[PDB]
Structure 1
Amino acid sequence: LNIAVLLGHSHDVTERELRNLWGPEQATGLPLDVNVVALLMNRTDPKSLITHVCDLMSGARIHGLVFGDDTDQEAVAQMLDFISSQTFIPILGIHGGASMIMADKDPTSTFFQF
């Protein structure tokens, strides 16, 4: 369904190329909705992160999040896990601080890491 892919300046790839991943992403469309909303993120302030996540949540009701970061800040990972508990949004850490492994997550959080 409605899934958000949120990247920073990693490789400076625009959101259009992220939106291009609709055919290969479940070509045999089971929910016939699989719409991908791609946003660009300039800085990793926790206030900005929370605002972006929950505003995009209020916008078109995203059912997931694929978060990638270009900074070596592990705290971002934590700032996602906490959010996963407050929003019940499955979040997937891709690159940077988000992909840094986390020891213990609260059970009510659906955050997963690569």
Structure 2
Amino acid sequence: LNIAVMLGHSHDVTERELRTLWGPEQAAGLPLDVNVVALLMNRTDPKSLITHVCDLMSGARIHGLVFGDDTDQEAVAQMLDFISSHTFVPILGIHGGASMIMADKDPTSTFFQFGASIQQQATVMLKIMQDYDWHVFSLVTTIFPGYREFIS
């Protein structure tokens, strides 16, 4: 197959061949044969993002592009999902931008994240509290998007 890789040019902005050097011999046999099309990115604009993804698609029969950003705009993920809802290619983010989980994605879109939702955070919280005998508390919340779900 083929699966392009894009990076945020922040941590590993060097040795693109090293990322291209995935699985020198194999990993566990490698029944299929895949090659990366690793492309370094730049400042991410919506028109720029769409044009890059579409043109890069129009090339080497592309598949689940593994996106990764360096900044924190909280919107790129949404934009990313949008593309994955109109072009049937999987997309899963790793670092930063495409890592803050949105509540409810579209039901005909293939897009996956690597973070943890609010429910898991609340579960870890209550597992910490239960382990130090702090069985009394009173949560306070502001008017911020998603407080109803957390309280519920």
Distance 1:110 1:95, change over 3 A: same
In structure 1, runs of 5+ residues without a counterpart are none
> Hey, what's the Cα distance between the residues in 1 that align with 2:106 and 2:26?
31
Tell me the SS of whatever aligns to 1:10: coil
TM-score when normalising by structure 2 = 0.67
Q: Which has the higher strand share?
A: 1
**Identity in percent:** 96
Q: How many residues align?
A: 114
Distance 1:87 1:68, change over 3 A: same
Tell me the SS of whatever aligns to 1:78: helix
Distance 1:28 1:80, change over 3 A: same
Distance 1:2 1:17, change over 3 A: same
Structure with higher RCO (Cα < 8 A, 6+ apart): 1
> Hey, what's the Cα distance between the residues in 2 that align with 1:96 and 1:53?
19
CA deviation after TM superposition for structure 1 residue 32, in Å: 4.1
CA deviation after TM superposition for structure 1 residue 93, in Å: 1.1
CA deviation after TM superposition for structure 1 residue 14, in Å: 3.4
CA deviation after TM superposition for structure 1 residue 15, in Å: 6.1
The answer (yes or no) to whether the contact 1:15–1:39 under 8 Å persists in 2 is: no
> Hey, what's the Cα distance between the residues in 1 that align with 2:99 and 2:13?
19
Distance 1:101 1:35, change over 3 A: same
Structure ID, larger Rg: 2
Moved more, 25-34 or 69-78: 25-34
- Pairwise CA RMSD of aligned residues? 2.1
Distance 1:48 1:29, change over 3 A: farther
